[PDB]
Amino acid sequence: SAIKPDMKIKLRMEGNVNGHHFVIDGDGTGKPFEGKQSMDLEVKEGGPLPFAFDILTTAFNRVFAKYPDNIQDYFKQSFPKGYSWERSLTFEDGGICNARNDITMEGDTFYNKVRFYGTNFPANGPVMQKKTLKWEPSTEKMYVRDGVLTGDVETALLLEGNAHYRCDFRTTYKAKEKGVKLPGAHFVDHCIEILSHDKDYNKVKLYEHAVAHSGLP
């Protein structure tokens, strides 16, 4: 195994949402075999962000997911060369974004080069008015579409006042190394949470737990 039980995380995100430019750095640690990661995020440019921080958080690595023996782990088999992903997020009110991550490994550390581009968010909407509270727990459906490992998520952000704001993500995952075998179809359950934050979300502690399963208990 190239992957150790405790792995460091380094991350830089550059992005623009509705015109607004920003740069965010990440430093964290994770347990790839237990499916747990936590990281400290700091806005370096463009703060304070004029949109809900929550729309970024799923962009801040499926190597952090507990995979049972009976599912092929495409992500851990991708290292040390690594893998990339591209994601489209489609929100119920027309907001649309495109995120990508290129993930590499050096020694005990995953490096993440993240880009995040959002547009078409209504000025009066919960993202530009900062009304989001959290992502609900979600299930990612993994399958192969025309030779490419694909994950679909139908999810929602909880808003102030007992309302939900619906999100559909599609992610495509590609190993750098030709001939990493594609897995069979499966599920990954996700729980993502902001553990702490400062006044305008310039500093955020982020936690994710993920578990791969075949649908049964």
Report d(CA 18, CA 26) in Å as an integer. Answer: 23
Which residue ranges make up each domain of the chain? 1-217
80: preceding bond cis by omega (within 30 degrees): yes
Report d(CA 37, CA 58) in Å as an integer. Answer: 12
Residue with tokens 């299930």: 139
79 torsion bin: left (phi>0), alpha (psi -120 to 50), beta (else):
beta
Report d(CA 135, CA 141) in Å as an integer. Answer: 17
Report d(CA 170, CA 105) in Å as an integer. Answer: 25
Method: X-ray
> In which element (H, E) is residue 37 found?
strand 36-45
Dihedral sign, CA of 48, 158, 126, 119? positive
189 torsion bin: left (phi>0), alpha (psi -120 to 50), beta (else):
beta
Alpha-helix residue ranges (DSSP H) falling in the chain: 126-129
Cα atoms found within 13 Å of the Cα of residue 206, Cβ hemisphere only? 26
Give the other-Cβ count within 10 Å of 169's Cβ: 18
Closest CA to 37 of 67, 6, 12: 6
